[PDB]
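Cross-posted from the bioinformatics board.
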Amino acid sequence: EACGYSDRVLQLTLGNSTITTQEAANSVVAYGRWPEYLRDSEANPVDQPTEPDVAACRFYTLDTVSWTKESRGWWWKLPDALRDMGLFGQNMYYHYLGRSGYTVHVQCNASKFHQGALGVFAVPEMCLAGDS
Amino acid sequence: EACGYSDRVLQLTLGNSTITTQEAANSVVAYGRWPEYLRDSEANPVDQPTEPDVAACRFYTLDTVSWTKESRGWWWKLPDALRDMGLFGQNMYYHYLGRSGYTVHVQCNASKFHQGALGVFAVPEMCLAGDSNTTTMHTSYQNANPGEKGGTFTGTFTPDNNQTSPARRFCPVDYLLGNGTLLGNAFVFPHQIINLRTNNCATLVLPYVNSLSIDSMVKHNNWGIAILPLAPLNFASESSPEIPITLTIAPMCCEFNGLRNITLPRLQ
Amino acid sequence: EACGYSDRVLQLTLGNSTITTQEAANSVVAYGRWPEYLRDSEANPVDQPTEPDVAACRFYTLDTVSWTKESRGWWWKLPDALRDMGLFGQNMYYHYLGRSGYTVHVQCNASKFHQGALGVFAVPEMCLAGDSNTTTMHTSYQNANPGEKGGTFTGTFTPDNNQTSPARRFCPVDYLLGNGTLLGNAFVFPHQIINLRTNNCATLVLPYVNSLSIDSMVKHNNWGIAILPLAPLNFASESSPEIPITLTIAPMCCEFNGLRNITLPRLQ
Amino acid sequence: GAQVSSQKVGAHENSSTINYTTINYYRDSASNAASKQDFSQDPSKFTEPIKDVLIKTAPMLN
Amino acid sequence: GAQVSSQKVGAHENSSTINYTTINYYRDSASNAASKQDFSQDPSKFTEPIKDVLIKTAPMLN
Amino acid sequence: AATSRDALPNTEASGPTHSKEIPALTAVETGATNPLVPSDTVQTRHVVQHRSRSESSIESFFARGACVTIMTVDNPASTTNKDKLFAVWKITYKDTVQLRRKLEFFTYSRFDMELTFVVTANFTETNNGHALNQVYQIMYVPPGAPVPEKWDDYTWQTSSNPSIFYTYGTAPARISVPYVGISNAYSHFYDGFSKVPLKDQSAALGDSLYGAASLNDFGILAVRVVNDHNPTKVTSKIRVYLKPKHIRVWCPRPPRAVAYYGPGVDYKDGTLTPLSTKDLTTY
Amino acid sequence: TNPLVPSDTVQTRHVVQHRSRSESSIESFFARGACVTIMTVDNPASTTNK
Amino acid sequence: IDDSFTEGGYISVFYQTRIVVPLSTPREMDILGFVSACNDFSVRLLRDTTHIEQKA
Amino acid sequence: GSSST
Amino acid sequence: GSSST
Ligand SMILES: CCOC(=O)c1ccc(OCCCCC2CCN(c3ccc(C)nn3)CC2)cc1
Ligand SMILES: *C(=O)CCCCCCCCCCCCC
Ligand SMILES: *C(=O)CCCCCCCCCCCCC
């Protein structure tokens, strides 16, 4: 915008949490589909759902990892990574069934004299291979 | 533009070739005239012209030179620099007559910790001075026409004393623009400056300029490209820094008359 | 015409070249199709084509051959015969793809006391037979492509027996049109006859013919010109008469795609 | 989608156009039978390929 | 209940749309053949999944 | 608008002539054939013509299934030391002479292709055992795909290649193929090479066969007997019949006059004298 | 992915396109019968011990 | 498949000038390359791949 | 009857 | 229905 707006600078707010960034490369909406609640036409369990809204749909920060020259890569599974995260986790373990979408924000700053490129991938059904 | 467009970022496309730049300082159209084909009202040879279009009007990259603290300057003549360049050169040597305009793109990148400023000048009829104090107007065609390789400027006039086997070449002193006039005034010629803190490149669009509508490209050069360090190269603290200068030139709106057998010049 | 015009007298002009003839037998347009440029609806390479126009679409005269009582016949392939011909050849070797039509003008004059008849045939895809009875389809590119010089027919098939260093060349027997079919039927191909009592020349206008809209001119010849004596040369009473045959060919409506560096073929 | 066409009737019974019916069962044209409803053209591009149109009653050369 | 559709005709005989006919014999859709009358979509959900629509002539980053 | 089965032109009645019009005189040097009809040189009556050129139309000329190859496969005892023979055939019209000659009347062609498979089998040994009815798999392997090395390896799964499973004793198998060429027409003749010999490059590297375009144009048919080894050995042959349908042809050529010698236009010494002795003045 | 076509980076001529993606449609890609298994059965003499 | 009759040509990358870094900066770096098809791209004649197999 | 397409 | 000819 001539009045200053940019694809690199974003503010995200969910619940009581806000993320700012001054060096973003736009953002991706997977398969072009924004998260939605389950529609009556596609519904299947007949009982009144629990929808925690701001108590669970907020930003949880997981433990920081460290990138080095030896680093081969990292992986996480959802909802598993969030199973102990506040009221989301509690709601998850009290109910047989649950569905959820996610905003994933990966953070990695360095300096104009550093180099490196991280590929951040979101895989549906990421079945990994075993050790045997 | 609020939707991102800038004077520093350009894309040029001619034929099967595209140049991009992210650090330009706009571009110059010499004398405000874009290249054009010869109009019927200004025409002179009556035969149907050859116009090679995309086969010749494309970007040719000449050999990269090297800028150092010792560098006094470099020069090229057009069409001479392009005489061996693909189908442009072939068309040039098969016809008695030819005319052409040019897009000149000078390339020189470095780093936010380097300094230096290159003056890039396009001179119509750049007649240079020779090496002799005993005879005048005597530079050989071979020496006057270096092709792609170009020539260099010198900080010192040093006269050819071999009267029995004269070198017969130019001796272009830099502050005198190699022709007896002072370099500080060369800015009345179409030009740009590559100042390393500001831009990676210079782009000059040159019209065909001559006192005739069309002429012998083999006997006569229309434009001279002169590149001189207005401010010397410098870096951090290194006593001997170097950065490359690459020259890419495209013929534009070129047409040729008088087809016959190919000219095979004595270039050595 | 009551004001003098005739089927025997023609003037052809292409580029800076003009052919006149006072003893023609009309002229042939092969398959009734005049040469044309490639239409957008039939186009295939997407890049802007090079169309040399007058620089290439002009009359090139190849080396004169000699007709005698021993002469079995002569053959040429197109574009191969023209590969070294001025700017046509240059454009041909700088591009991956090219297409072209041709005006072929065969020249042979003699006198009211001479006899003989030359059959001039234009064959699409003139694949000729090789010299080997032990291996097949084995004629080398060098031998298959004689350039301007062309090749000749033989009255006798004589097989290359050198199995260790095979000659790898054609052995075109004349009554079998060098390909296993009988010469008397070659008249289903576009043709004219130079019968010395009737005409000094043959003129064939050839369209680009292929199973593709455009192709590699360096890998593939589209047309073959075959000239054979249907009736042997004869004169007065001289046991060894001779008259020259000169071949002049013009590319027509030629366009080229896929520009890159020049192809330098192994021709020996 | 039935196609109905005339038969050129050769030997007639002691028995008015006779027809036959065709239906295509497959999506690909390649699967189709041969129509045999073909056209004829003039041989000129082979028999008369000369630039100046010939009149048979006139001298071929003039 | 016959269904009549166009064939995309490739190699033509020396012989106007050509059609083919289809009739379903069974009550269950699963028994049906493949129509092959399929649609195409734009690759955007995979090639351009970004929240802010891109203009190719403009700087991707700004 | 002239149909193939339309009648030819009627003969018109023609009378005596004493004219400056000269139809009989001409000059073949021009390249043209004199378009004469009998009434130009003789007195004719009026005939109403009924004959037609229906059977000499390009379709009609080729509307017949021709044998292009014979494939041999077998199904041996389990105990034999020789492998079970499956057949591989590189697809072409050039292994037999008859259809090849008809197609070579023309330089180029376009057509859809109908392939019919006739399968016959017999007992090999003066044995007395028997075999149950055989099923055959005819797999088309297009250039690029894994060619089978064994009668029973993974390639015969055919997840993407077209295959026919033929039951012995039933009507002969038949399929249609579209015009599959990577050109706008099939070239019956290619006066060229598939490689340019480059000066700078090795002589051996720029070399290729004369007249040959893609080293593998259309792939192969791989045929096998799906039945497991029987104690009694059975040998089978598959004859392939090709019919060009929906055909178009370009640029006519003289027919082959001497015996074919390989895939190209080459002729063999000793086969070059097709014509018989007949004297100039003998009827 | 940058949605470029040749005319964005080179000079192009006008071509009327006739090619189609008909055979790479999801139906067409899978429209072929693939072998998923081989089952073995037999019918022995009455007298066999198996 | 690799076939000279249908050969497509050559892709090559070059330094036009050179990579220039300041001091305290890594003098070596990587570039990554990606390929994709333009909207005029099509394929035909479905076949089996050599890129997967099943010995036994 | 005939559903055309 | 019936395309006649
Ligand atoms: C090299 C000289 O010959 C040719 O030019 C030439 C030209 C065209 C000819 O047509 C061959 C085209 C082959 C296409 C094949 C595609 C599909 N085929 C099939 C398909 C399925 C099955 C089970 N069996 N065969 C078999 C044919 C054959 C030969
Ligand atoms: C046009 O065809 C409408 C009339 C259809 C008449 C009955 C057709 C006979 C059965 C054809 C079945 C479809 C073939 C797959
Ligand atoms: C719509 O289908 C009305 C016309 C029917 C035409 C005849 C159909 C051919 C026989 C189909 C029999 C039913 C299949 C169980």
